[model samples]
Target: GSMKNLIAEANQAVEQFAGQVKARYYPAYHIAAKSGWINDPNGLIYFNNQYHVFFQHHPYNEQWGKIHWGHVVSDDLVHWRNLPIALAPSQEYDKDGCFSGCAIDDNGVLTLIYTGHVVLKEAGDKSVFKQVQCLATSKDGIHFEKQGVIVTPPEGIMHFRDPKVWRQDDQWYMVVGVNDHDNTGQVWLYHSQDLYHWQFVQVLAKMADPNVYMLECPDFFPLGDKYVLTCSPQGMKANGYHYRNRYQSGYIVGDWQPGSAFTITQDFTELDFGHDYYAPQTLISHDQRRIVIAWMDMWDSVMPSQADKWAGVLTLPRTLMLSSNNKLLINPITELKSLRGIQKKITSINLSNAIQDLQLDSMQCELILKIDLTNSDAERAGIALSASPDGKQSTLLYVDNQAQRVILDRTYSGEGMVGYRSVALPADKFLTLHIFIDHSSVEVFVNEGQATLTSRIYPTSEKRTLFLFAENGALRVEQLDYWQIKNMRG
Candidate 1:
């Protein structure tokens, strides 16, 4: 395996960097005592009664590259056990790196399917990232035996990878994200029964629009009675209010069929309805509930972890339920309630003035703040998560009557990793923000569950406090409560 030396070097580099970075910023969490970067959800499966999740990780830096599958498992999605480095580039087939894909179980044997990327230095040579899909099987669930590649480039598409596998009606199917040989944005589908042999089915569906170029990480599955197709689309036309992130990770809720032309009637729904959510993957729970997990971070987005040496953190696992109307609603897994330590008094009130109400300190707590705008028009209002003393650093989720937008600003969380300004909140009359302040990150929810904003802030140890601020006349913090949370892993 020619890639052995290169991988060894990259792993060493990543380990050294992750060690230093995790200590500086990501240590308190159950993740690596030292942090690096996490991207692209991978190998999301339910194994041994525990929800196992993995993602493409770059241990060398917070930036995306030199990727490997970083593994973690949890009984309750709220807390995770950071397992050892799961997969790395090792053979000529995956010489460049092990990109993102997924895993499944073959009658209790954990089988992982992932992409091997190789870039050629010369023109007309194999394409940079001659994407190959390989399989690895594990009998004990902890160690895996490489089964080599199962799918190579098909004639009609370029840049093909990320194969999601599932069994249905006594048959196995895989849908990989790829562009048409014509280079149009679409996904290619295939089918198989015996893991080793596969048959090309047909072109599944084009991106919602033909103007787009390519879509990566295509995942198709059934939710309730409808089928949902999710992908990260590249080269999308700016719609002003849509395609908000660097790329878009959303799904079309409709019906799907194999070996036939498919139609998607509904518009693609953004998975997180947040600025940072991308590369989403789903798993079925023990009770057959559909669960969703996404990379809590996005590529090229500003992260405070860059300064501390590590870069990303995942969103807590969320249960994805298709509402009766067919739109997906994400609720934090019920297990998270177990993390609550003591209730800090729940109260509801109306506001005629704007100001700070809670005194926050270095603490592990969950704060739910709801503001009712049913009656008045206040200039501005919302809760502040992890605010710094100078107010130069901190995150705010507030309705800006001034701008008429719900603004999520992280410009001042810390230096080096900065500048991801989210303008997603639709300035509706009524607003609610669910703020979860762990040792390092902040997850903010708006309007019941219309939008969620998750960000990592590496503030000075002394600045780990919360405050409520409003500008220009009356804005309400209608309901507010704090709960001290306990450690679930320790």
Candidate 2:
């Protein structure tokens, strides 16, 4: 059933939505600017020499009530151009909303695949939520022709969404996160020859396997020696210092047996430990490296930008690599190094409980600091960022005392984030934090970008200085580097 009425209304609402956002949005050096609720980066594939990224956008409303696909294209990840809304609720299959999904390039044909929602009433009973997969294609990567639901969710599958599809050899494969009637998270698999007719494969993993409840956004791809299966498990304990998000994004490294069932045999590895990383999407770059980007926002918790008239943003694109131990490694893409401005080289200094100033006011700056824990133990160790003239402002501390972790205490960063921390930082030779501070957002990369932390803080423009302070240990400023980023919005 075509949703012609819904489509027309959505188109009009989104245009107004785009106008209000463009008026208020401003870019920080690394943080996504203020905009409407943007969740789940979909259609994040590079085709025809252009980067196409569609997101879960509620273009008409300031909050995330109505769901539509927000479209943006970029030749380089650094520079982006906002395009018109791509997918609207146009059919009965997606009345509630067009929820999260992925895109693919099937034999040079650019295909956008996603989940469509509907209220299914069975035999005069009350209507229940239903999900189905739909397809839209673009030849030149601009205009698209959407073909309605091709694969309906099998009965007894609850919360089935976020389908990741790819073409392996000549067969088309799709993996979707599912919560079985038992309320367990498992990825159900299916195989197709032409992207329409699908045969059920098997449930790859299950909640009985250690996690609980449901898994969202299941991704299957090959990384070196193993096939990596990544998903966001709903109920995972914060183990000592890992998988801290209310929802966890991690992967099972193993081999896939498509002929028998979509079976994987390996330990699940946590992708990131910080807040604001979820619903990750990946694509193979021109250099043949698998790159990933995630929605740097969370669920249930309060977002800072809700007051600024919009919310939700994405982390910068990161490169994913497989280490010799069959573990995944992440690094900021090399393209970011191009944005590095003049370097500020300085000798190491040991500041004891005193705030030393370097006066960092550039809109864009890079900070590389090392905290040495060689001498006596310290209760807390970190730096105060965006320091105010009155000596009262926000401070982000990387305390390695008891928890061995990094904490973001933004209770003073204009009253949004209460504070959050990454998982335990092992007793290392040194802790390297490479932070990129845009105008309002700050992204922290810990231990050579081994793990990442993303948060947006709004401080007064005058409070744009740097101060370092620590307790106990002979903390020394190893290397201080600053860069002025130019590509503000992209």
Candidate 3:
């Protein structure tokens, strides 16, 4: 089918079933498709004074199936307008599915570089597939014309996919993820002069271990005085709290030059300490600010929202800055303040009782909390969100001062999923939390984005109570600022 027809059909499904989905699990501000399945943010770029975000979309059902390029545009990065399906599996190159890639403004035209995937047959329980680099062009930024296969893998390799292209000086560069014949993760580099006709460069980065399968969704860019290459690696072993997810989204920070291997500086650091983060892509904006967005759903997760005919969403756009310690710091953009509606403030209170209360009008809100741990005598201190009146069902986000760790405990949050993940604070005397709570999601930025925890919570209660508590001791709340969040869609 044509792109327009596919988009029309998908939007019709939204019109028919979007209202049926449970409102408690629907995001108030995140960028989710109207219906069906979505994963791996692809083709994120800015052109003609607008930001474009495309994703791997399968609109027929709430499961992963035939892939298409789902599109949306934003003028201010806070509000988005859904556009038509940009690219579908129509031509011979991508007859099976149009997979993930990046977008660039080629002078006056908008160009997309992506992977064309074809499943050959079943390989035991899994299916065998072939992937190649492909291109599509658009003049109006809404409609695209497929340009067929532009780059192919070398002999005996079938896993070359996900081309992330960018321009430097006068030439264009692309980095593709692949699995070598030895069954290891690797990335290959390619250069093009006019967005077409490429020449192979050397291996940009690769892992020699046998257990690692392939590095997927490779993004290469410059951050600060160094370079950053980020990817999602499959079959990588867990590193304590890091790599605890099924697949890991992380980056290797170092220095890079053209036609040379990336010198490894800080190896394999996770971008987000959250359960539902994967396949993040970054784009340098027109003003040279590095921004990132990720698939806010994980593989093999119990997607409770899928029963409502939609599955996934994109994370809030984050600004990336290189920290002084050679690590990446991710924080919510300044534009997110626009979503704040009513403001309430509290100052200099000591928590000697078990619980402190706040009056909130809605579950959708933003909280800025600062705790004076230097004078705190509390053994454990934290906040409870989306709590029922009886406190039997609420998400717990707290700091363990004895253990020096930050924890998110959702064991009693709601229905579909629950667990706990602790992030190490590594010797900090104070705690500052910037939290955003939508109807079904919670994003916690700890200590100016030193560590972030993003998770989805399905709270059944429409009305929720907020509580702050100190366990077995006293804690000081230096300051608290709360705001009801605004729905950007309306």
C-alpha TM-score for every candidate? 0.89, 0.90, 0.96
Q: Give the TM-score of candidate 3.
A: 0.96
For candidate 3, lDDT tens digit of each residue in 1-490?
A: 7766765776676567656666767778888877778899999998899999999988777898879888989887888877777887876668778999999988888999999998788685477778989998998998888877889888889889989998896899999999898888888899989777898888898864568788999999998889999899899887777687888888889988985679988887888887778999988777778999999878998888887888888899998888898888889988888888889999987786488666565478888888787776777887888887677788888877787677888888887777877788635677888888887778888887787888878777767878888887887888989998888787
Location of the lowest summed lDDT over 10 successive residues in candidate 2: 22-31
Q: Please, what are the lDDT tens digits per residue for candidate 1 over residues 1-490?
A: 4333444554676667654553334534323323567777788888988878888887667677667777888886667776666677777777667888888888878999898887756455355447878888877765656778898876544588889999987898998888676668777788889878888888876764776777788888888777888888887765665676777788888876664565676677666545567787888888887777777666765666676677666666677777777877766667778787767754665444655546655346777777766543567666666676555567666677766666666666654355444445445655666677665666766654556666655666464666676666566656677877665556
Q: How far is candidate 2 from the true structure (C-alpha RMSD, Å)?
A: 3.4
How many backbone clashes are present in model 1?
4
Span of 10 residues, lowest total lDDT, candidate 3:
353-362
Tens digit of per-residue lDDT, candidate 2, span 1-490: 3444454565566555544543222454333323556788888888888877788877655577657777777776666676766777767777667888888887787898899877666444345678888888877775567887877766777477888898876898898888777777888888899998888787777755554778888888888767888888888877765666678887788776566544455676777766667888888887787888888777876665565556777778888877676667777777877677667766676666566777666345667766665541466667776667555776465665766667776667654556665646645767777777665566777775566777666675454677777666545666666665666452
How high is the CA lDDT of each candidate model? Answer: 0.70, 0.70, 0.84
Which portions of model 3 show Cα errors greater than 4 Å?
A: 1-4, 208-210
Arranged by lDDT, best first: 3, 2, 1
Better of 2 and 3 by lDDT: 3
Predicted model with the maximum TM-score: 3
